[PDB]
Every structure is written in C-alpha cells, then in structure tokens.
RNA sequence: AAAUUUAAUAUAACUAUUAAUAGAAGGUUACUAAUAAAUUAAUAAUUAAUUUUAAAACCUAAAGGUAAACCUUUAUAUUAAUAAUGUUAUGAAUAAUUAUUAAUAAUAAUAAACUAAGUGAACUGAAACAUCUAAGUAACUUAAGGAUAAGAAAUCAACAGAGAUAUUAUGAGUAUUGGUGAGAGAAAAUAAUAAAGGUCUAAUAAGUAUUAUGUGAAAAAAAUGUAAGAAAAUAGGAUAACAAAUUCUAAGACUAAAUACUAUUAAUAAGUAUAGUAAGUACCGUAAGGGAA
RNA sequence: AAGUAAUUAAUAUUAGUAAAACAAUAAGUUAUAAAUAAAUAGAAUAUAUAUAAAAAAAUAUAUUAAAUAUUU
RNA sequence: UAAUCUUAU
C-alpha cells in the first residue's frame, strides 16, 4: 500500500525560539504530529481509520454508462480495553483496524508499534492516544525517585 | 513536549551507541599505496597488450 | 602510486574510504554487527533474526565492481560470489545455456 | 573657440526574449502620524558602506463587539510596600487622596502567480448520440515552500548489457490501442541541459505482499473501497500461464543542480503612442460585477 | 475592421552537395531493391532474372531489375 | 447476553 494522502500533507515549519505577533494562550499538551490533521476526509480525524479514506469512482452499467459514486470504509464505533490507561476507549474504527488490533493484542500495542507505516495510519486522535499511553507507561516504569 | 521513546526505539538507540563505541575501520595509507601499485600494474599490462 | 589511486573514479574511492582492503570481509552472510560483515551480502541481525537489506543496493554494488574491473582492483573489494551477480567474461564462460536453447 | 546635429544614458513606460541577482502595505481624518547617532573608507563639512536609535492616531474575520475607519473594556490599571496628608473609634486600629518602589497582560493588515492534494462539469468533437471525446482541463476547496514535486531501483533490459531523478532532440507518429469510429499513443537506446551526486537517518519492516471482488492516467500501472491472507535471502517481486534463465529486494528514510512563477538589474527589439504610464477613476448596477474620454 | 502562426506531410521551382544528402559528439532521417500478410527468400532485351500465389521445374498474372566503360 | 443500537437523569 501507499500512504499518499498522509505523507503528502505539509504543515508550516515552526521557527525555533532562542516574539511572534500572535502567540496562543494555552500550552501545547501533545507533541506535534508529523503529518498534521487531514483536511480531506475530516470524518477520519475523530478515530482510527488505518489510513483508509473515501474513494471516489464510477458506477458502471451494462451499457458502460459511467456515473460517479463514492466508497466508504466500514467504520464502527467501538469501546476497547487499554491495559495501560485502565479503561475502555471508545472510538470510530475501520473494521480492518479492529482486526489488526485483535491480531496485535490490544489497543496500546497497536498505538505503540514503532514502524513509520503505523505512525502514518494513526490519526491525530490516534497520535494523542499513543502519547497518552506511552507517557503513562513511562510513569509506571519510572517514579520521580528511583 | 516531545513524545517519549518506545522500548524498541530505546533498544535501537542503545545498539547504535554500542556500534559507535568501537573503532571505525579507517582507510590505511599502506592499503592505499598497495591499491595504487595494483592500478599501475594493470595499466602497464594494458599497455603491453 | 598515491597519485594513481587519487586519479581513480570517485565512487570507488568513496567505497574504499568506508570499506578498505585492510580487513577481510566474510564471503558468506554474517551478523550485521560483526566488523568483517560484507556490505554486498544480506547479513542477519542477532537480536531479531531479520535479514537486513544489503548495505549496498545491488545496482550500486554492481557499478562498483565494474569500476574495480576497469582499473584492475577487483581483489581489494570484498567477494561478490554469494550475490548471484557475475560479470563479463567469467559470466560468459560459466553460463549454462537455457533449457529453451539446449532443447 | 562656442554653438548645431547625430547616437547612448534618468528618479520618468509597458511588452517579448536572453543573461545575472533575489524571493515582496493599503485606506480613513486629523489634537498631521517627526528622528537621532556611532564606526569605517574616501577627502573640518563631505558622500558611500556597515550599523544602533526615536516617533508612528484610527480601520483593514479571530482583547469583545459593531452598520470598516466607531463603541466597549479601563496598564494616568489592579495588588503589595512605604512615605506626607485629612477623618473616625481606642502610643496602637480603620478607611480616603497623592507620590515613589516592586509584581502582574497587552494588539491574525499581509499579497498575487507558481507547487502539491481533494472534488470535478458542460459546451464541444464523433458531421445524430448514449461507449468514447473535451478532461483529470475549467471551476470550486485545502495545504506548504522559495521554489514545490521527483529521486539512488522489489528499474530497465535480454543472456550482451546499463545503472537515481527532472525534460528537451532523435527513436516516433514507430510499437500499443480505439462504438478497431472520433481518435489516442509509449519504452529501450543515443544525445544534449545539469550538480560533488550519493548517502544512511531503519535494531530492515505484515493485516503488508498476494488473491477474490468493485473502481482506477483512450496506449504503458500504481493506486484504492470491501472481505480472505503468505514466506526468510534455503526467501520474495518482476512476464496471460508453466518450465528455464535474467534481473531487482516492497511494506524505513535524507538529498543540492537543470525547472515553474514573481520582482529587480543589464542587454537585444523589421514590438507598442487606440500594448505609451492618468483610472480601476467618471459613470453604469441593490449586489457580485462591468467600465469611458 | 477580415486567409495569420505554430508542429507536421505531399507536390513544384531554384539554389548547395550528389551515389549519396542533412547532421556531423554519437545517434538518427531520406535515398541506395523490388516483392510479400509474414517468414530463414531477393536482379546476366526478354523469350533471361527477382518476389508474390502455384510448383518437381517451367507456364501462366502482377510489378520490378538487366543493353572497350565510368554504377542508379 | 460485559454483541451492537435507542431515550432520560
Ligand atoms: Mg447597537
Ligand atoms: Mg487538481
Ligand atoms: Mg523535495
Ligand atoms: Mg522525498
Ligand atoms: Mg490525453
Ligand atoms: Mg525487506
Ligand atoms: Mg529499499
Ligand atoms: Mg445609479
């Protein structure tokens, strides 16, 4: 496969600070997602889609009469257990993604898998979840005092 | 705040560090000389041919 | 001799810089973290038995070999034999003709 | 020895090409919205370069509003500490004003073309029309950068070989293909243009390759929705299919240069005075919008 | 205020060179051999020969080449 | 019925 609608997204490169005319009031809680939020099938940003998007193609008849149609991924809203968070997390879930999760053994595992492909096929929400989980894990491992 | 490293990532980093610790096979001057000599010989052979 | 070496093509020189002939690189596949590990061969990592893709993509390796051949310096490279790529005269010699040609 | 002419040059035109270099405020009306140096070189004034420095009202989606150039908050702010001061109740306590010191937030005016991505007509052509065509074009929408994209082969080739991309000559209107109509149309190879062009940043990659099915650059796939779903270099991919043989290593990455568009400078004009600076004004329309002399 | 431009193709005329031409980095284009769907086939007055269908080889049909010399 | 889904607090 290819992650063409993820790895093609580009975000305004930040100027690092050794002030700007408009600085935000709050503090960036989460680390910046490499690929940013998708401006294409924004339904996907709410949950875990595995880099699957709406396709647009042609309905074709017996007379070869083309007529535009769309294809949706099989999204299902699904509350799934996270050992690290110690609670079930409900999200939108392409059934493929669900299957993958099942295979890999847990949502935490899915989130915290290293490969770039996995990173790509998380959403911004997915990224956030991953951050939460890994941070939690770190905390568990390493209390402030050894 | 930067995302914390994953276990696998950490391991990889460690491995990299270990690799770095060892001496890099730097090019030997003697070796270079030898190579040059070989090249010269080859050239001579070609000329002869 | 040094001058001659310098004269050689750039790619070859570069290769020499990181993989000199002082060390004898193993003919067969190895650990990826051994220092006698051949760049041209797909070596394996000890932790996680995963064959790493060759440190020189095949094409590049082939090019390097060709360059070496051109300036006589074949033996100072590591051995290619275990990659199935042969070159020029030897290849011609050792080629078993195809089933379709023979019968 | 002064004038006259000819040709060239401005702060003072635009347009096309070529070469170089670089990637930037509008309005409104007024309590009008200003400057100050230093250092270095040239010759105390000097010009230039390199610098630091003052001011700068209001408006131009997002301090919060509104009927743009207004209103509303109240940094001639609040809190704390003190100091002089007046009043009250009991030297100590409470409130008020002024003055110093400290603490605590302040202001999305920002291009256009070029690039990438999402969706994606129709007129039209076919001498009708529905497959096809126009066309992944216009248009709308989103996002980045000085450029972007691409890029070091799971590529091409043919048993001889080459060796990243980009796009120009040829190849070639050839192969390929099409209601085999309208029509569409490669690649290898050889040349130019180009830059040092190679180089690790992956503990080397599955819900991935692949298959089935629905779509999918008129010719060459790579993509993709839905479900099935591998293998360790003793292994994978590449061709209707199989057998040989070749070749490359997917599911991890970075990448200057040639290129596009803008702006400036320089040059060249069998270019423009109805393509020669006014004005996006007058005027027309509720408006988008049109638009003179 | 109305037959223009670009990229091609075919004819003509004139010029350059000419069994070669253009380009000359290497390619490539056209010509130099006709014919056949294609294939391993292909030129001495014609009555000889080449290719196609046919065939043992000719004939027969079509087109081509071929006449002390100096190639088209 | 700790599939999925609907409403109220
Ligand atoms: Mg009001
Ligand atoms: Mg588009
Ligand atoms: Mg880039
Ligand atoms: Mg890239
Ligand atoms: Mg087309
Ligand atoms: Mg691999
Ligand atoms: Mg690779
Ligand atoms: Mg009016």
Return all residues near A106 (Cβ < 8 A) that are at least 6 apart: A81, A82, A83
Q: Cα separations (Å) of A120 from A38, A50, C11?
A: 11, 8, 35
**What resolution in angstroms does the PDB record give?**
3.2
CA distance C56 to C73: 18
Which nucleotides of strand D lie within 7 A of protein CB? 106-109, 116-121, 130-132, 136, 142-146, 149, 152-153, 155, 159-163, 196-200, 202-209, 214-216, 222-227, 229, 232-234, 243-253
Q: What is the 3-state secondary structure (H, E, C) of C42-101?
A: CCECCCCCCECCCCCCHHHHHHHHHHHHHCCCCCCCCCCCCCCCCCHHHHHHHCCCCHHH
Q: Does B39 touch chain C (CB under 8 A)?
A: yes
List the single residue in B3, B6, B8 with the smallest CB-CB distance to A31: B3
What method did the depositors use to determine the structure? cryo-EM
């Amino acid at each position: 496969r290819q992650w063409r609608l993820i790895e093609t997204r580009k975000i305004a490169k930040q100027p690092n600070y050794q002030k700007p005319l408009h600085m935000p009031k709050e503090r960036k809680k989460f680390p910046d997602y490499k690929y940013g939020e998708s401006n294409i099938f924004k339904q996907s940003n709410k949950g875990l889609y595995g880099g699957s998007f709406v396709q647009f193609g042609n309905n074709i008849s017996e007379s070869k009469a083309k007529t535009r149609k769309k294809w949706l991924p099989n999204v299902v809203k699904k509350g799934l257990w996270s050992e690290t968070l110690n609670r079930k997390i409900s999200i939108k879930m392409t059934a493929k993604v669900l299957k993958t999760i099942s295979k890999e053994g847990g949502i935490d595992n899915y989130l915290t898998k290293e490969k770039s492909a996995r990173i790509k096929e998380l959403g911004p929400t997915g990224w956030k979840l991953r951050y939460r989980v890994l941070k939690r894990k770190d905390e568990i491992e390493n209390p402030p005092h050894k | 705040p930067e995302m914390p490293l994953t276990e696998v990532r950490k391991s990889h980093l460690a491995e990299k560090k270990e690799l770095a610790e060892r001496e890099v096979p730097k090019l030997t001057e003697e070796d270079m000389e030898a190579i040059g000599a070989r090249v010269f010989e080859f050239l001579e052979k070609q000329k002869r041919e | 001799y040094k001058q001659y070496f310098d004269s050689l093509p750039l790619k070859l020189k570069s290769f020499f810089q990181r993989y000199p002939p002082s060390i004898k690189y193993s003919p067969v596949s190895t650990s990826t973290k051994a220092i006698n590990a051949n760049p041209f061969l797909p070596n394996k990592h000890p932790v996680t038995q995963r064959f790493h893709d060759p440190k020189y993509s095949l094409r590049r390796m082939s090019d390097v070999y060709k360059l070496a051949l051109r300036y006589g310096v074949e033996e100072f490279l590591p051995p290619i034999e275990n990659t199935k790529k042969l070159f020029f005269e030897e290849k011609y010699n050792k080629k078993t003709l195809m089933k379709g040609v023979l019968l």
